[PDB]
Amino acid sequence: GKTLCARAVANRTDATFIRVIGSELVQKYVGEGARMVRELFEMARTKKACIIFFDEIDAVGGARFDDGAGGDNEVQRTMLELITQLDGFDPRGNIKVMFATNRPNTLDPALLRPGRIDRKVEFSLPDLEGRANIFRIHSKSMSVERGIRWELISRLCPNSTGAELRSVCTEAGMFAIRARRKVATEKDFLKAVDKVISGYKKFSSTSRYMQYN
Amino acid sequence: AAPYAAKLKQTENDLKDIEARIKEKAGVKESDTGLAPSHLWDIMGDRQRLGEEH
Amino acid sequence: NVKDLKASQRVCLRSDSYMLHKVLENKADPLVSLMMVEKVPDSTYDMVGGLTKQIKEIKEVIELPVKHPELFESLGIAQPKGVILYGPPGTGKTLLARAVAHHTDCKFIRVSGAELVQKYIGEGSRMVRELFVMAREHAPSIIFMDEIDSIGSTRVEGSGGGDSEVQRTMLELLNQLDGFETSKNIKIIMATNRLDILDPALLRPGRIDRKIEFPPPSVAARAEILRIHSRKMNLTRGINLRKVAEKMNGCSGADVKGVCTEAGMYALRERRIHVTQEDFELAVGKVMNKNQETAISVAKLFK
Amino acid sequence: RCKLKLLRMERIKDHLLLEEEFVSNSEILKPFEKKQEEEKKQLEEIRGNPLSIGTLEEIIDDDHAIVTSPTMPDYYVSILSFVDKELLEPGCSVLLHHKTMSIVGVLQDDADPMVSVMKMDKSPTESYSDIGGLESQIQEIKESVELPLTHPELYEEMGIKPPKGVILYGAPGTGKTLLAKAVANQTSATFLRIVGSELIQKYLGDGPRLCRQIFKVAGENAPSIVFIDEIDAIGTKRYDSNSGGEREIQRTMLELLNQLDGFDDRGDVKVIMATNKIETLDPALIRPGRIDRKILFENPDLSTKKKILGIHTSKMNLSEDVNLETLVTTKDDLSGADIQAMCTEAGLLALRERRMQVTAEDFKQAKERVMKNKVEENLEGLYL
Amino acid sequence: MVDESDKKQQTIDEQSQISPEKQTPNKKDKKKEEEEQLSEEDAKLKTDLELLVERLKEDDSSLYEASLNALKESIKNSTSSMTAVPKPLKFLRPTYPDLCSIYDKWTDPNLKSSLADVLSILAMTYSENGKHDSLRYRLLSDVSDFEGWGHEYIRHLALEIGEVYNDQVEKDAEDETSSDGSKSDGSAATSGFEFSKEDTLRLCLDIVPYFLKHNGEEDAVDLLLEIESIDKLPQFVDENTFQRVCQYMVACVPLLPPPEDVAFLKTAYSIYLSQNELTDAIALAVRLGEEDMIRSVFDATSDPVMHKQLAYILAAQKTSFEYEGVQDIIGNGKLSEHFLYLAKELNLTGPKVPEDIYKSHLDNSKSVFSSAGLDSAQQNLASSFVNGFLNLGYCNDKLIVDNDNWVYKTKGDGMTSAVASIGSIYQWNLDGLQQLDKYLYVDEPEVKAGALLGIGISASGVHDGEVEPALLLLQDYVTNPDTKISSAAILGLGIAFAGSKNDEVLGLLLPIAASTDLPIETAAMASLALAHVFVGTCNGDITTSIMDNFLERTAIELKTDWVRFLALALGILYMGQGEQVDDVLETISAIEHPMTSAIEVLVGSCAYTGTGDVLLIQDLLHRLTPKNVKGEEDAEIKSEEKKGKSSDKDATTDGKNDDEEEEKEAGIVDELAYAVLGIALIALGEDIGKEMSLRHFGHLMHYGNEHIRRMVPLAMGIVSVSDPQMKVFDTLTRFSHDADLEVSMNSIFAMGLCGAGTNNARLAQLLRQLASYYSREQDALFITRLAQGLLHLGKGTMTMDVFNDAHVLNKVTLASILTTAVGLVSPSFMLKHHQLFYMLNAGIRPKFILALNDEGEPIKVNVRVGQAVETVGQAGRPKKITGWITQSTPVLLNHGERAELETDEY
Amino acid sequence: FDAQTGSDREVQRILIELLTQMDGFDQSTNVKVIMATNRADTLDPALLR
Amino acid sequence: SEGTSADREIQRTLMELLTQMDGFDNLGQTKIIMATNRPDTLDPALLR
Ligand SMILES: Nc1ncnc2c1ncn2[C@@H]1O[C@H](COP(=O)(O)OP(=O)(O)OP(=O)(O)O)[C@@H](O)[C@H]1O
Numbered sequence A: 001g002k003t004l005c006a007r008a009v010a011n012r013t014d015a016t017f018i019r020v021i022g023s024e025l026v027q028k029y030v031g032e033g034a035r036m037v038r039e040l041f042e043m044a045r046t047k048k049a050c051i052i053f054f055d056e057i058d059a060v061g062g063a064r065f066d067d068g069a070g071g072d073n074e075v076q077r078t079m080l081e082l083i084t085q086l087d088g089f090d091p092r093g094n095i096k097v098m099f100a101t102n103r104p105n106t107l108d109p110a111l112l113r114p115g116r117i118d119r120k121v122e123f124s125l126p127d128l129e130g131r132a133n134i135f136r137i138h139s140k141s142m143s144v145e146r147g148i149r150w151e152l153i154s155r156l157c158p159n160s161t162g163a164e165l166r167s168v169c170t171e172a173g174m175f176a177i178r179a180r181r182k183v184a185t186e187k188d189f190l191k192a193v194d195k196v197i198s199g200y201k202k203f204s205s206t207s208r209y210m211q212y213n
Numbered sequence B: 001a002a003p004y005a006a007k008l009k010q011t012e013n014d015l016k017d018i019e020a021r022i023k024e025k026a027g028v029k030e031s032d033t034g035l036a037p038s039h040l041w042d043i044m045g046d047r048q049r050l051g052e053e054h
Numbered sequence C: 001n002v003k004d005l006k007a008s009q010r011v012c013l014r015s016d017s018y019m020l021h022k023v024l025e026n027k028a029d030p031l032v033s034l035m036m037v038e039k040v041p042d043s044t045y046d047m048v049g050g051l052t053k054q055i056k057e058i059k060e061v062i063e064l065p066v067k068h069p070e071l072f073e074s075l076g077i078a079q080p081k082g083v084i085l086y087g088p089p090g091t092g093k094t095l096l097a098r099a100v101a102h103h104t105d106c107k108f109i110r111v112s113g114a115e116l117v118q119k120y121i122g123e124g125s126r127m128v129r130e131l132f133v134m135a136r137e138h139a140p141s142i143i144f145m146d147e148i149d150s151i152g153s154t155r156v157e158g159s160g161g162g163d164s165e166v167q168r169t170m171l172e173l174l175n176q177l178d179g180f181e182t183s184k185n186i187k188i189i190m191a192t193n194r195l196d197i198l199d200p201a202l203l204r205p206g207r208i209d210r211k212i213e214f215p216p217p218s219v220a221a222r223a224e225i226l227r228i229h230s231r232k233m234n235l236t237r238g239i240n241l242r243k244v245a246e247k248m249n250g251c252s253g254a255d256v257k258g259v260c261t262e263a264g265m266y267a268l269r270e271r272r273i274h275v276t277q278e279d280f281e282l283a284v285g286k287v288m289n290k291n292q293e294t295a296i297s298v299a300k301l302f303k
Numbered sequence D: 001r002c003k004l005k006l007l008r009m010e011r012i013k014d015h016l017l018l019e020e021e022f023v024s025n026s027e028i029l030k031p032f033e034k035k036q037e038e039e040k041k042q043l044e045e046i047r048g049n050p051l052s053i054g055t056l057e058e059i060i061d062d063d064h065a066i067v068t069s070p071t072m073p074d075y076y077v078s079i080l081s082f083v084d085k086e087l088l089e090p091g092c093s094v095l096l097h098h099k100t101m102s103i104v105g106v107l108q109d110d111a112d113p114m115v116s117v118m119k120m121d122k123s124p125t126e127s128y129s130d131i132g133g134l135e136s137q138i139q140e141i142k143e144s145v146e147l148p149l150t151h152p153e154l155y156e157e158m159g160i161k162p163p164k165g166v167i168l169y170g171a172p173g174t175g176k177t178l179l180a181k182a183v184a185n186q187t188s189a190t191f192l193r194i195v196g197s198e199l200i201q202k203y204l205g206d207g208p209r210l211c212r213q214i215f216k217v218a219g220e221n222a223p224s225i226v227f228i229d230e231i232d233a234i235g236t237k238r239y240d241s242n243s244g245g246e247r248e249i250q251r252t253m254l255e256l257l258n259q260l261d262g263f264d265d266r267g268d269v270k271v272i273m274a275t276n277k278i279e280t281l282d283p284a285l286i287r288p289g290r291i292d293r294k295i296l297f298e299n300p301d302l303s304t305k306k307k308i309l310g311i312h313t314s315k316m317n318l319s320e321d322v323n324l325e326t327l328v329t330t331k332d333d334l335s336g337a338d339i340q341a342m343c344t345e346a347g348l349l350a351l352r353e354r355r356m357q358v359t360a361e362d363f364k365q366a367k368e369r370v371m372k373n374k375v376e377e378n379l380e381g382l383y384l
Numbered sequence E: 001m002v003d004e005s006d007k008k009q010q011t012i013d014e015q016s017q018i019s020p021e022k023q024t025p026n027k028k029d030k031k032k033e034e035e036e037q038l039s040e041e042d043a044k045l046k047t048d049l050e051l052l053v054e055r056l057k058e059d060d061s062s063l064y065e066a067s068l069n070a071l072k073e074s075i076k077n078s079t080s081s082m083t084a085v086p087k088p089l090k091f092l093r094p095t096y097p098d099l100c101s102i103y104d105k106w107t108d109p110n111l112k113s114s115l116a117d118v119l120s121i122l123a124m125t126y127s128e129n130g131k132h133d134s135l136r137y138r139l140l141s142d143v144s145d146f147e148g149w150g151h152e153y154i155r156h157l158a159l160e161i162g163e164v165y166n167d168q169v170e171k172d173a174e175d176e177t178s179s180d181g182s183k184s185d186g187s188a189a190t191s192g193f194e195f196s197k198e199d200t201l202r203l204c205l206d207i208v209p210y211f212l213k214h215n216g217e218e219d220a221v222d223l224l225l226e227i228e229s230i231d232k233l234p235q236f237v238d239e240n241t242f243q244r245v246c247q248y249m250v251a252c253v254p255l256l257p258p259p260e261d262v263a264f265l266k267t268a269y270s271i272y273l274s275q276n277e278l279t280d281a282i283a284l285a286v287r288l289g290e291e292d293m294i295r296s297v298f299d300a301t302s303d304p305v306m307h308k309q310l311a312y313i314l315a316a317q318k319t320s321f322e323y324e325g326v327q328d329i330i331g332n333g334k335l336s337e338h339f340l341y342l343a344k345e346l347n348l349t350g351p352k353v354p355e356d357i358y359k360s361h362l363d364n365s366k367s368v369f370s371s372a373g374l375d376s377a378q379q380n381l382a383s384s385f386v387n388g389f390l391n392l393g394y395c396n397d398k399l400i401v402d403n404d405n406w407v408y409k410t411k412g413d414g415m416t417s418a419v420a421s422i423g424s425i426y427q428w429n430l431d432g433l434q435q436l437d438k439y440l441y442v443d444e445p446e447v448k449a450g451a452l453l454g455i456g457i458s459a460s461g462v463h464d465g466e467v468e469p470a471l472l473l474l475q476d477y478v479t480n481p482d483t484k485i486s487s488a489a490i491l492g493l494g495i496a497f498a499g500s501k502n503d504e505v506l507g508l509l510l511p512i513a514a515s516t517d518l519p520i521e522t523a524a525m526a527s528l529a530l531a532h533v534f535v536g537t538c539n540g541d542i543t544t545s546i547m548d549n550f551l552e553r554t555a556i557e558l559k560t561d562w563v564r565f566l567a568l569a570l571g572i573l574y575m576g577q578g579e580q581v582d583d584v585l586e587t588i589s590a591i592e593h594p595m596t597s598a599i600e601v602l603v604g605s606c607a608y609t610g611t612g613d614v615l616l617i618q619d620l621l622h623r624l625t626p627k628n629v630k631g632e633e634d635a636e637i638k639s640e641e642k643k644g645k646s647s648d649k650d651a652t653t654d655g656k657n658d659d660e661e662e663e664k665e666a667g668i669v670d671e672l673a674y675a676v677l678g679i680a681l682i683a684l685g686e687d688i689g690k691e692m693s694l695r696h697f698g699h700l701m702h703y704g705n706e707h708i709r710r711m712v713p714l715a716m717g718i719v720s721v722s723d724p725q726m727k728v729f730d731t732l733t734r735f736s737h738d739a740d741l742e743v744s745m746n747s748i749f750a751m752g753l754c755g756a757g758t759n760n761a762r763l764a765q766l767l768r769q770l771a772s773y774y775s776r777e778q779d780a781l782f783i784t785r786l787a788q789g790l791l792h793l794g795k796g797t798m799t800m801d802v803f804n805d806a807h808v809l810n811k812v813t814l815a816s817i818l819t820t821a822v823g824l825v826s827p828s829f830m831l832k833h834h835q836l837f838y839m840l841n842a843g844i845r846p847k848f849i850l851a852l853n854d855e856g857e858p859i860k861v862n863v864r865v866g867q868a869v870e871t872v873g874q875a876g877r878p879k880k881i882t883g884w885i886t887q888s889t890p891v892l893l894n895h896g897e898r899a900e901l902e903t904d905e906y
Numbered sequence F: 001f002d003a004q005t006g007s008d009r010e011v012q013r014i015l016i017e018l019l020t021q022m023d024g025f026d027q028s029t030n031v032k033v034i035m036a037t038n039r040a041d042t043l044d045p046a047l048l049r
Numbered sequence G: 001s002e003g004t005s006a007d008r009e010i011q012r013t014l015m016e017l018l019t020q021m022d023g024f025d026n027l028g029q030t031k032i033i034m035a036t037n038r039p040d041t042l043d044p045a046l047l048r
């Protein structure tokens, strides 16, 4: 829930949220997108108490390197246009800046210099306690027959996401309707833990991040 | 194919109504922007339309 | 009024307010724009003849559900989709698709990878549906998506054919086209140099159900192409064109049209009206010599 | 009598309906004569003629706006007379007054040749059980696609969020194509269908605008079911390499993650994806909760293929000669598109005869042609 | 094709393709010369037949045309068909196809016309022989395959169809017409038709409906009975035969306005009776609505078997299913006479066992409240009625009622309706009487009156077997002379017994409903109750009701409301009949006044039901006419005019509704629309008229049973927010209710927007609130349909109070009426001898595929769902039984019927 | 061609007129256009036909 | 001109130079001195 706590924080702060998609920053002809970024930042300076949330800037934000015949250079113009605005020749006057990256595997080293992205927070996999917390937020929301263990379901699981725990409920809810139960019991929760895990292995849902830039 | 063939023609003849109905329904059709409170806005925005500032 | 007026019909305007005067005595049609700009005729089967077995195969599977889709309805058969014409170039693969279009009473829309035809969209990844929809308007039609399967040289490593990429888009549409305004009449006449270079997802079950191989010409068939060409020219009597077909061996239908042309350029030089039997000793020798000078190092028809 | 009964009621009712509306055209205008009749006069004079098309770039909240016309000149127009400012907001095409330009109303909107590929003109005439058999891996596509539209009640009892997404995967010809178009007939809500070969383009930047669009239209006209047919086609199809390539593939993928999901909070856009290259996708695509129940299909078993072959031979002429069960014997863990091609090829043998009958002989012959396809791009014979 | 002479037998066939030598020269010459040679022709007939058979395979027009060209001439030119009398007659077998080759294979317009007439004559003459039947047969079952016969055989069959149809249109009939030249009847073509029917029933389906209906007689249908009842099981299964039959009645159901329709459906009932399944018998007997047909099937199981067996249990179940209670009364007392067991049998027929099964479904459905918390003013009144509307059917909400606080805060007419709403909590239940009793013995008369209404509602589920009938309680109140008390009493009695016209119930209501001299507004209930009682069964068109209506018109015209209710009451009374209702239209019209004309247009709908297309057009000319006369001129009255206009609008909708149900289900999509243009229209026809057509639309949909329920109510609703009369919303919701929370997710939001948003009158607000709660029942408790459900062509009797109320501007007095809304559907459960309360499994199908029915017999693939689910409404209605794999056989076929499942486990 | 920008649709509109006037130009005693090109990879399929 | 539109802008302007340099337009007493910083960038029709 990379983007889920930043929707939580968008509820709390009540500042402007201006969201960017990194694949939205690439246009047909080169230097068009140069226009876009520059302009967007200066509109946000005029704006008072605002937040720019950089989503999915894995393309457009990537590492700079030379190809000598590429078509990557044309994209790396806009990559540069992101640097030159953040330091500026003036500071950010109340612009709070988030960058959301799937990957630290490739990033710019001047979009990941430590003075303009300040403290940088690794978001982690839930613990054996942390899955129990998540799955209580999720089963308190569901009708279940009282006397259950939310601890049990976490153990059964390996080290895993809570996005699986949001789907342990909902697939258990489909095993709920097939039995023609208004309620959810232990028995259907077991079938569902088996269902998600078998699928994860079959593909390779975790410990994989793809791409190269 | 007698038993079926008769129905087949009668289906085509039927279709001819459906086209005709689209044209009669669309002959007397009206369209709006914003209805009842912007009837009021006509009183006002017609005095202001005579001037030049647009 | 608005019911005497319609889309893509030219009106006259009296311009001081643009107040509609008359309908104009013209109307534009967008499908002819494409068809002309490409430029292709139509034909009969007397301009293909000699691969008379081929005309039988294609008349069965294309012509007979146009004239009478009723027979197919009773049998209960989902009528042919993609029908592969393939073989050596110029063996009159293209002229068969033309010949069927006249007889079937279809618009012969030759597609050929061109975007010069267009100036209002300009790519074929946004003009698969619009192309199908013009052919629906001006129904029926024969959509000659000619995929050569060698265009580009990064596009053949890139997809096995960049033309087959667009072919795949069409063909999938095509699966539910059994009724939506009442079945097919927009045929997929596809063509290629072999099907070993076609993607194997274009030859998947039920997707391709008739496959038409076209050989190089027979010696009886090669004489029948020569005889058609002799009616434009003025010969001398006593020339057997069964003799000429045996001087030649050809390897395509391409070879004999350039034998006929060369004899009348040789008679042009001569400055006599008649075509003589000796011109055809030299002519047969000029094409057969040309055919070998692009294959000794695999040189193109260009620099 | 069984066709007729249907016809007799339904026709006579469409004939009456049509007639009704002719007498009725006049009758519309009769309950008013100054109560609305007068109102109409007032609006018109304001409007005059021509109403000049503009394009609205942005609004200002002081009753004005900046239009840029396609004829060149920008104008600082006023939003005055017969207009809500809630029906204004970027992207609108507006009616301007032919002396002083005031926005008298918004009526004009113009469809794209790309929303024309996306949007469908049909409702599928075929419905479910035209590839039927494997009809328990179909209640993973009707308890998560069909059913939360049909019943909110069931998922209200259990509470929480209701289902979201499916990825269909398996052998080719095992029904994937027809599955998607068979749930769209039953639900009857906006069925978008896009090919993945059109998501791959030979021009950059427009790639992402196309993929960003599909879900934006989708959420607007919600409920919607978006069939992405073939998302196996994103790594195997690619034109040139200098406006194609890695870069263009990576970007369209990135875009598609925001749409599904992402931060958008768009409309209902259940997703149906067909694939067989499921490992040429992201881990944030085959992520759970954008895939919920995922459906695996393998080749049918021997007794399943008997369900399949009796669907297909009902539409055909039959005899006592025909025997289904020995056709089943020959094929061994093959697709039901193989079985669908033998029946389609069997009438090709009828057509070839010009005999209206279909016999056991016609089904066995086309079985030999179907098995020729399989083992002759083979040339090993016996497994070397 | 080309001639290759007599070298082998194969090439003889090729020789005769161009020119026959054994059918043309030889034979022709032979016939035109010697008459010893008649003996040679006779032997050669067999040879000639064979040559036709071999060349049937050839399809080309040219090589049948020319080949048999001179034979076609020879009929009149040389042979003259009487040069050897018998011999040309029996040689007409090869020559008859020769004529058909110019009719059908070659099309020459002049000869195609002319030789149609010739073919008819020679068909008749050769069917004396019975060899014209055999001629048809070799092409019907075929011997060869060619395109040709597929167009040709029809022509032979069409000759018969032609003449028989023509005898109705043109009275002269027989061979006097030269359009066929063949006699209509007589023992020469009659025997031909019977034999033809046999062959065409086996292999085809085509000519069998044309023959019966073209004779126009039930006699034709009764001949059919004989042949089919042989076929019932050995030739093909029971099921195939049932599908074969029901349609004689259905294509030609809509297609029988009253005197024919009843006579045909009698025969179908009898076919079912003859066959194995009595289950098919009961469905058709209900349809007819005759008392006589119901009794015969019930008797057939009950009387012959001395032992209790399956037979007594089965009888009780079958009659139980109709919740009209018409079958219930009739079937009771036979059980008492036989006396195996009184206790089980009597209860099982009654709707008392239906109370118990509801508890099992309810055990699942639980309670979720959502009722308004508003108090004070008119908002108090709104909320208290709303509580009853959410707890319709058997529900337990005792404690809320027992809090008498909110109860006592109701005032005026509100008090009466408040007590009435309490009764709907215990609708279809024996217990609940206790709450009503408290109020009834204390305070002002207003609460006393409201108690009686509530007794009515509660008594719906218990009034048979002489177990607390509504009659017992309510008789005392009728005796009491106060008007409010008596009026309330007879309203509740009518509701509870519904279609039951028991002696005690009917005969109480028989001297009364005959005072209208005294001016009393609330004496609408006098006729209104009696009308409700009558529906569900054949009607006597009672002399009590007809008399009092006329008398009211004489006495008063001041109370406009009173006479408007009265007019509707007559039209609702006549429902359940149509044959007899043709007579009473004239009787009413005898006395003519413009006020009387208002009554006539209503009654026209019922008389003309089971066709309406002379009725439809009439109810549209009427709409035009007000405008037409003022319109015409340029190029006391108040009461009469208003009654006139309103009656017509109601009549138009009503006509349409009965019509759409009985007959083809496809046309339903359009029939709703006959109204959308009707509405746009009325909303268009007069300023005054717009008010009436809004309200009518909602009940149009509910009565008509529209397929589409998502788009049309919601879209119409938006326009009608602006428009006056919020009672429009109430009428929409009765349709929208459907299977709860499918349609109704959209409905609650849509209706809730206008209500919550706008407040500008608490009067307007009240109508909107009631409508919203009606639509939903918590956890899919029950559904409401106008239809019986047992038949989907059917129409209920309990839902007629709903249908009545939409003809008038909204009133506080009307609110008391609206509390009643009965019309329950039971959820099916597989029964045992110990009365098992669980279903095992069922298949549900949203859309029937079967184009071998309208109704669509539920297929056998389905989608499987669990135990103990409510019988789903639209988009779930075809229901097939899954139980066969677990060793269970249904005894009672269920197609999505109301009827509870019953299984015999093996 | 791109043909997604105003400037390409200018290039093209002239070429369509050449082709159209070249059809007009046939069966005349003129010599149909002499043209040269540096490379053979600027031809369109319709031009070369 | 598998790239951007820029590259057919190059092409329009280049074709103009060739007709000048050698054509039925002839030069003259006009001279070209062409200064470049790397000559294997060029189109070989500008190496001519
Ligand atoms: N740690 C958690 N506790 C509770 N809910 C969680 C948690 N992790 C994930 N979720 C669930 O996952 C849903 C979607 O996660 P979200 O899109 O916000 O995440 P993310 O980490 O930014 O990943 P991505 O951006 O790649 O989608 C959340 O709405 C929530 O229901």
Ligand SMILES: Nc1ncnc2c1ncn2[C@@H]1O[C@H](COP(=O)(O)OP(=O)(O)OP(=O)(O)O)[C@@H](O)[C@H]1O
Pocket: C175, C204, C206, D129, D130, D131, D132, D133, D171, D172, D173, D174, D175, D176, D177, D178, D179, D274, D308, D311, D312, D336, D337, D340
């Ligand atoms: N169970 C079946 N019954 C009837 N027809 C079937 C069945 N399975 C598949 N078919 C038919 O086979 C053809 C191709 O199948 P479809 O496109 O539905 O699925 P798929 O597994 O994605 O295969 P492909 O994409 O290669 O066509 C269609 O005409 C389809 O109806």
Ligand SMILES: Nc1ncnc2c1ncn2[C@@H]1O[C@H](COP(=O)(O)OP(=O)(O)O)[C@@H](O)[C@H]1O
Pocket: C046, C047, C048, C049, C050, C051, C089, C090, C091, C092, C093, C094, C095, C096, C224, C225, C228, C253, C254, C257
């Ligand atoms: N069957 C044929 N009869 C007569 N001339 C033919 C025949 N086939 C080929 N030709 C001649 O050869 C030319 C080349 O054949 P064409 O139709 O262009 O080939 P392709 O097979 O490549 O589509 C034709 O335009 C025609 O002049």
